[PDB]
Design an enzyme around this catalytic site. Structure first.
Site, PDB file in Angstrom:
ATOM      1  N   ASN A   1      -7.785 -20.098  -9.835  1.00  0.00           N
ATOM      2  CA  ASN A   1      -9.129 -19.503  -9.741  1.00  0.00           C
ATOM      3  C   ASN A   1      -9.059 -18.052  -9.251  1.00  0.00           C
ATOM      4  O   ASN A   1      -9.761 -17.191  -9.781  1.00  0.00           O
ATOM      5  CB  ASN A   1     -10.022 -20.324  -8.782  1.00  0.00           C
ATOM      6  CG  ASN A   1     -11.449 -19.909  -8.838  1.00  0.00           C
ATOM      7  OD1 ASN A   1     -11.952 -19.168  -7.981  1.00  0.00           O
ATOM      8  ND2 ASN A   1     -12.125 -20.339  -9.903  1.00  0.00           N
TER       9      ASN A   1
ATOM     10  N   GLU B   1       0.806  -1.204   0.000  1.00  0.00           N
ATOM     11  CA  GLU B   1       0.000   0.000   0.000  1.00  0.00           C
ATOM     12  C   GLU B   1       0.835   1.249   0.000  1.00  0.00           C
ATOM     13  O   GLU B   1       0.326   2.301  -0.366  1.00  0.00           O
ATOM     14  CB  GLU B   1      -0.925   0.039   1.219  1.00  0.00           C
ATOM     15  CG  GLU B   1      -1.975  -1.047   1.265  1.00  0.00           C
ATOM     16  CD  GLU B   1      -3.093  -0.852   0.297  1.00  0.00           C
ATOM     17  OE1 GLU B   1      -3.935  -1.725   0.291  1.00  0.00           O
ATOM     18  OE2 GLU B   1      -3.147   0.122  -0.485  1.00  0.00           O
TER      19      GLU B   1
ATOM     20  N   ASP C   1      -6.210   6.489  -5.176  1.00  0.00           N
ATOM     21  CA  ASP C   1      -5.744   5.114  -5.228  1.00  0.00           C
ATOM     22  C   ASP C   1      -5.906   4.616  -6.669  1.00  0.00           C
ATOM     23  O   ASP C   1      -6.235   5.385  -7.571  1.00  0.00           O
ATOM     24  CB  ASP C   1      -6.452   4.254  -4.175  1.00  0.00           C
ATOM     25  CG  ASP C   1      -7.901   3.907  -4.526  1.00  0.00           C
ATOM     26  OD1 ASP C   1      -8.485   4.359  -5.525  1.00  0.00           O
ATOM     27  OD2 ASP C   1      -8.515   3.170  -3.765  1.00  0.00           O
TER      28      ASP C   1
ATOM     29  N   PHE D   1      -8.410  -6.241   3.521  1.00  0.00           N
ATOM     30  CA  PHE D   1      -7.968  -4.855   3.637  1.00  0.00           C
ATOM     31  C   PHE D   1      -8.195  -4.104   2.329  1.00  0.00           C
ATOM     32  O   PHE D   1      -8.644  -2.963   2.348  1.00  0.00           O
ATOM     33  CB  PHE D   1      -6.500  -4.827   4.107  1.00  0.00           C
ATOM     34  CG  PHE D   1      -5.967  -3.474   4.450  1.00  0.00           C
ATOM     35  CD1 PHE D   1      -5.539  -2.580   3.472  1.00  0.00           C
ATOM     36  CD2 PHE D   1      -5.791  -3.112   5.790  1.00  0.00           C
ATOM     37  CE1 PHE D   1      -5.041  -1.336   3.866  1.00  0.00           C
ATOM     38  CE2 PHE D   1      -5.240  -1.871   6.154  1.00  0.00           C
ATOM     39  CZ  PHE D   1      -4.913  -0.983   5.151  1.00  0.00           C
TER      40      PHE D   1
ATOM     41  N   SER E   1     -12.977 -19.811  -4.861  1.00  0.00           N
ATOM     42  CA  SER E   1     -11.601 -19.756  -4.393  1.00  0.00           C
ATOM     43  C   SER E   1     -11.536 -20.089  -2.902  1.00  0.00           C
ATOM     44  O   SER E   1     -10.662 -20.833  -2.464  1.00  0.00           O
ATOM     45  CB  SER E   1     -10.997 -18.357  -4.597  1.00  0.00           C
ATOM     46  OG  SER E   1     -11.014 -18.001  -5.976  1.00  0.00           O
TER      47      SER E   1
ATOM     48  N   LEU F   1      -8.817   4.316   2.758  1.00  0.00           N
ATOM     49  CA  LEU F   1      -9.807   4.983   1.923  1.00  0.00           C
ATOM     50  C   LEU F   1     -10.622   6.034   2.710  1.00  0.00           C
ATOM     51  O   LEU F   1     -11.154   5.750   3.771  1.00  0.00           O
ATOM     52  CB  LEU F   1     -10.725   3.914   1.342  1.00  0.00           C
ATOM     53  CG  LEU F   1     -11.932   4.395   0.501  1.00  0.00           C
ATOM     54  CD1 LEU F   1     -11.396   4.925  -0.834  1.00  0.00           C
ATOM     55  CD2 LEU F   1     -12.903   3.232   0.270  1.00  0.00           C
TER      56      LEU F   1
END
Ligand SMILES: [Cl-]
Length: 164
Positions: free
Chosen positions: A132, A11, A20, A104, A117, A32
């Site tokens: 997948n 990040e 972003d 996250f 998945s 965010l």
């Protein structure tokens, strides 16, 4: 290596409001602020999150405080979600960090949408889960990040994050 070091790599750290990869106003270590196009809305959210008049700039301590809260929130979101918690409980400590990373980035709801998945991970079909997982908007929009997380699920090691 741990989840905090992992997410700090994925990040980065920025002390001024930035956009972003999706164009949304963000600050710190991927915190965010708002999906609103309005910079004023983003500044108002920031001031509320920090508890002072920031004018769009925060200190490193403040960024790391938001980061601690966000990691804690992601873990608690996994453990309260009926689709995520059993996957998380089934995994080793390294693969748990990969699941936290996904939550996250894209939220508890987004990750719980990866039904097939999650089943494969719970069954410890790692190579198949990795295939997948890559069939996703997530992989096609942020492929280098997605590859590091997927490699972590596939191998159960931190190798994708070493030398970074
Ligand atoms: Cl990327």
């Amino acid at each position: 290596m741990n989840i905090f070091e992992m997410l700090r790599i994925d990040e980065g750290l920025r002390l001024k409001i930035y956009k972003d990869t999706e164009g949304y106003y963000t600050i710190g270590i991927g915190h965010l602020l708002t999906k609103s196009p309005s910079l004023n809305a983003a500044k108002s959210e920031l001031d509320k999150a920090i508890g002072r008049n920031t004018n769009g700039v925060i200190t490193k301590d403040e960024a790391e405080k938001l980061f601690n809260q966000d990691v804690d929130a992601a873990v608690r979101g996994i453990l309260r979600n009926a689709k995520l918690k059993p996957v998380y409980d089934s995994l080793d400590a390294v693969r748990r960090a990969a699941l936290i990373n996904m939550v996250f980035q894209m939220g508890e709801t987004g990750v719980a949408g990866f039904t097939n998945s999650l089943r494969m991970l719970q069954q410890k079909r790692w190579d198949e889960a990795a295939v997948n997982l890559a069939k996703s908007r997530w992989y096609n929009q942020t492929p280098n990040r997605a590859k590091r997380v997927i490699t972590t699920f596939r191998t159960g090691t931190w190798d994708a994050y070493k030398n970074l």
